[PDB]
Design an enzyme around this catalytic site. Structure first.
Site, mmCIF file in Angstrom:
data_model
loop_
_atom_site.group_PDB
_atom_site.id
_atom_site.type_symbol
_atom_site.label_atom_id
_atom_site.label_comp_id
_atom_site.label_asym_id
_atom_site.label_seq_id
_atom_site.Cartn_x
_atom_site.Cartn_y
_atom_site.Cartn_z
ATOM 1 N N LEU A 34 13.483 76.679 52.196
ATOM 2 C CA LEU A 34 14.091 77.201 50.972
ATOM 3 C C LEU A 34 14.458 76.086 49.997
ATOM 4 O O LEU A 34 14.113 76.152 48.815
ATOM 5 C CB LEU A 34 15.310 78.067 51.309
ATOM 6 C CG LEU A 34 15.003 79.229 52.266
ATOM 7 C CD1 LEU A 34 16.231 80.079 52.535
ATOM 8 C CD2 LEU A 34 13.886 80.087 51.726
ATOM 9 N N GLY A 37 20.324 72.056 50.344
ATOM 10 C CA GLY A 37 21.595 72.767 50.133
ATOM 11 C C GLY A 37 22.792 71.831 50.115
ATOM 12 O O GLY A 37 23.348 71.528 49.057
ATOM 13 N N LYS A 54 21.135 76.386 57.519
ATOM 14 C CA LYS A 54 21.474 75.066 56.978
ATOM 15 C C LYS A 54 21.602 74.063 58.129
ATOM 16 O O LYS A 54 22.273 74.334 59.121
ATOM 17 C CB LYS A 54 22.776 75.110 56.160
ATOM 18 C CG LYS A 54 23.162 73.762 55.524
ATOM 19 C CD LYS A 54 24.359 73.870 54.572
ATOM 20 C CE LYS A 54 23.941 74.313 53.179
ATOM 21 N NZ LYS A 54 25.072 74.336 52.210
ATOM 22 N N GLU A 101 23.547 84.682 55.949
ATOM 23 C CA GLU A 101 22.819 85.746 55.270
ATOM 24 C C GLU A 101 21.779 85.157 54.321
ATOM 25 O O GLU A 101 22.079 84.245 53.545
ATOM 26 C CB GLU A 101 23.812 86.617 54.496
ATOM 27 C CG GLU A 101 23.254 87.906 53.897
ATOM 28 C CD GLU A 101 24.242 88.571 52.939
ATOM 29 O OE1 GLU A 101 25.248 87.924 52.573
ATOM 30 O OE2 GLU A 101 24.015 89.734 52.542
ATOM 31 N N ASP A 144 34.966 74.107 44.654
ATOM 32 C CA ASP A 144 33.966 73.828 43.598
ATOM 33 C C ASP A 144 32.943 74.951 43.358
ATOM 34 O O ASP A 144 32.017 75.140 44.146
ATOM 35 C CB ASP A 144 33.242 72.499 43.882
ATOM 36 C CG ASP A 144 32.614 71.890 42.637
ATOM 37 O OD1 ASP A 144 31.744 72.546 42.028
ATOM 38 O OD2 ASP A 144 32.982 70.748 42.271
ATOM 39 N N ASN A 149 26.091 77.150 43.896
ATOM 40 C CA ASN A 149 27.000 77.690 44.901
ATOM 41 C C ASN A 149 27.081 79.217 44.848
ATOM 42 O O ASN A 149 27.733 79.831 45.694
ATOM 43 C CB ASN A 149 28.394 77.099 44.681
ATOM 44 C CG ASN A 149 29.132 76.861 45.970
ATOM 45 O OD1 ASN A 149 28.699 76.062 46.802
ATOM 46 N ND2 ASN A 149 30.252 77.553 46.151
ATOM 47 N N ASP A 162 29.191 78.734 50.507
ATOM 48 C CA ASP A 162 29.716 77.371 50.694
ATOM 49 C C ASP A 162 30.991 77.131 49.892
ATOM 50 O O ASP A 162 30.977 76.482 48.845
ATOM 51 C CB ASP A 162 28.658 76.290 50.380
ATOM 52 C CG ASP A 162 29.100 74.878 50.797
ATOM 53 O OD1 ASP A 162 30.308 74.658 51.050
ATOM 54 O OD2 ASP A 162 28.229 73.981 50.871
ATOM 55 N N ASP A 171 34.357 65.665 55.590
ATOM 56 C CA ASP A 171 34.618 64.254 55.850
ATOM 57 C C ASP A 171 33.357 63.545 56.334
ATOM 58 O O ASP A 171 32.893 62.589 55.710
ATOM 59 C CB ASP A 171 35.731 64.083 56.895
ATOM 60 C CG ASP A 171 37.068 64.658 56.444
ATOM 61 O OD1 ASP A 171 37.162 65.183 55.313
ATOM 62 O OD2 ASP A 171 38.034 64.581 57.233
HETATM 63 C C1 LIG Z 1 29.159 76.819 56.306
HETATM 64 C C2 LIG Z 1 29.387 77.569 55.014
HETATM 65 N N1 LIG Z 1 28.128 78.090 54.460
HETATM 66 C C3 LIG Z 1 27.120 77.309 53.932
HETATM 67 O O1 LIG Z 1 27.256 76.102 53.894
HETATM 68 C C4 LIG Z 1 25.921 77.889 53.409
HETATM 69 C C5 LIG Z 1 24.903 78.357 52.944
HETATM 70 C C6 LIG Z 1 23.689 78.867 52.379
HETATM 71 C C7 LIG Z 1 22.994 78.007 51.520
HETATM 72 C C8 LIG Z 1 21.808 78.395 50.907
HETATM 73 C C9 LIG Z 1 21.327 79.670 51.167
HETATM 74 C C10 LIG Z 1 22.015 80.523 52.008
HETATM 75 C C11 LIG Z 1 23.201 80.151 52.628
HETATM 76 N N2 LIG Z 1 21.353 81.762 52.135
HETATM 77 C C12 LIG Z 1 20.218 81.667 51.346
HETATM 78 O O2 LIG Z 1 19.402 82.551 51.206
HETATM 79 C C13 LIG Z 1 20.139 80.363 50.695
HETATM 80 C C14 LIG Z 1 19.139 79.988 49.861
HETATM 81 N N3 LIG Z 1 18.157 80.954 49.636
HETATM 82 C C15 LIG Z 1 16.949 81.014 48.893
HETATM 83 C C16 LIG Z 1 16.445 79.944 48.162
HETATM 84 C C17 LIG Z 1 15.245 80.076 47.475
HETATM 85 C C18 LIG Z 1 14.526 81.269 47.521
HETATM 86 C C19 LIG Z 1 13.220 81.474 46.791
HETATM 87 N N4 LIG Z 1 12.886 80.345 45.912
HETATM 88 C C20 LIG Z 1 12.140 79.281 46.618
HETATM 89 C C21 LIG Z 1 12.113 80.836 44.760
HETATM 90 C C22 LIG Z 1 15.018 82.326 48.256
HETATM 91 C C23 LIG Z 1 16.212 82.194 48.939
HETATM 92 C C24 LIG Z 1 19.114 78.652 49.231
HETATM 93 C C25 LIG Z 1 18.562 77.578 49.903
HETATM 94 C C26 LIG Z 1 18.522 76.327 49.306
HETATM 95 C C27 LIG Z 1 19.033 76.151 48.031
HETATM 96 C C28 LIG Z 1 19.582 77.225 47.354
HETATM 97 C C29 LIG Z 1 19.623 78.473 47.955
#
Ligand SMILES: CCNC(=O)C#Cc1ccc2c(c1)NC(=O)/C2=C(\Nc1ccc(CN(C)C)cc1)c1ccccc1
Ligand SMILES: [Ca+2]
Ligand SMILES: [Ca+2]
Ligand SMILES: [Ca+2]
Length: 292
Positions: A34, A37, A54, A101, A144, A149, A162, A171
């Site tokens: 994806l 992150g 992640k 999710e 933030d 986010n 997040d 940290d």
């Molecule tokens: C511990 C506390 N929680 C966290 O730290 C967390 C989290 C987290 C972070 C990112 C995602 C997530 C959850 N669920 C998702 O679906 C995410 C992403 N989905 C996503 C991206 C691109 C496309 C399609 N693009 C490529 C066109 C589809 C879907 C995503 C990934 C990378 C960068 C931006 C978003």
């Protein structure tokens, strides 16, 4: 408040989560990548569910990463329609995982990059969730609010992903959305700085002179942080956005945090009352915007 749709989904999430057991590294098949992150769209083989994994590379001791995991168990309790779902978190071959999710629209940062700039009616709905997200979190504190986010989806949902529930994680591992006083109301500021960034389609500090603004419709990292503090806040350009909206972000982007609007005030601000009332097909715009 929650609807009998938002309630039903949370029941459908939990029941489909109760089936998923204790998470193990080996029970995941990579589907695709994806983005940074680094998050993978995975398949939890036994359950057959699709998640966002992640993966954080961390050179630390047992007693350290075991803490991190214990702190992330708190995310099981924190369930809201404006917070991205949580399945679990573990450690394995030199990396901590956070299984969550899958939001099939990706980040607003991504949606911005392809949309160009986001329409006001749309940013109406984004504002409503971001508030209800922060208002849920309040009713632990947040870390933030960026467009990277905020995750969105084809169902038409808008969720904060997040926030900081684990200290040692923060940290063991930018600062350009921070309110001046950090150099609670900092969250509202960021929503104000973000909404502007998305409304005009560019990071608004420094502001664009009439050369770009007329056409539309670099500073070093530390040089910026000064400008943020010592000079006036960004504002939406007038004439192209409704004044109700212009006031909203203005009441968010007040440098003095006292004079800045709080959560309770923003929630009943004309802009919100207008938008909440509005009947907007968010899931259309998105899906059509980014080609799903
Ligand atoms: C511990 C506390 N929680 C966290 O730290 C967390 C989290 C987290 C972070 C990112 C995602 C997530 C959850 N669920 C998702 O679906 C995410 C992403 N989905 C996503 C991206 C691109 C496309 C399609 N693009 C490529 C066109 C589809 C879907 C995503 C990934 C990378 C960068 C931006 C978003
Ligand atoms: Ca692995
Ligand atoms: Ca393995
Ligand atoms: Ca094995």
């Amino acid at each position: 408040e929650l609807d009998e749709q938002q309630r039903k989904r949370l029941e459908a999430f939990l029941t489909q989560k109760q089936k998923v057991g204790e998470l193990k590294d080996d029970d995941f098949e990579k589907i695709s990548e994806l983005g940074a992150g680094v998050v993978f769209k995975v398949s939890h083989k036994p359950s057959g569910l699709v998640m966002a994994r992640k993966l954080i590379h961390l050179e630390i001791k047992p007693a350290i990463r075991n803490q991190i995991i214990r702190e992330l168990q708190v995310l099981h309790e924190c369930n809201s329609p404006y917070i991205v779902g949580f399945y679990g978190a573990f450690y394995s071959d030199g990396e901590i995982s956070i299984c969550m999710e899958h939001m099939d629209g990706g980040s607003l940062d991504q949606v911005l990059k392809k949309a160009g700039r986001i329409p006001e009616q749309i940013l109406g709905k984004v504002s409503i969730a971001v508030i209800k997200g922060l208002t849920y979190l309040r009713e632990i504190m947040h870390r933030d609010v960026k467009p990277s986010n905020i995750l969105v989806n084809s169902r038409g949902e808008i969720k904060l992903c997040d926030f900081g529930v684990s200290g040692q994680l923060i940290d063991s591992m930018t600062r350009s959305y921070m309110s001046p006083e950090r150099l609670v109301q900092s969250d509202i500021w960021s929503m104000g700085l973000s909404l502007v960034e998305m409304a005009v389609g560019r990071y608004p500090i420094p502001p664009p002179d009439a050369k770009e603004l007329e056409l539309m419709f670099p500073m070093a990292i530390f040089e910026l942080l000064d400008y943020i503090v010592n000079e006036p806040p960004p504002k939406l350009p007038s004439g192209v956005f409704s004044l109700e909206f212009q006031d909203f972000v203005n009441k968010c982007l007040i440098k003095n945090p006292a004079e800045r609007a709080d959560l309770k005030q923003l929630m009943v601000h004309a802009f919100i009352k207008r938008s909440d009332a509005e009947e907007v097909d968010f899931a259309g715009w998105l899906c059509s915007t980014i080609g799903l």
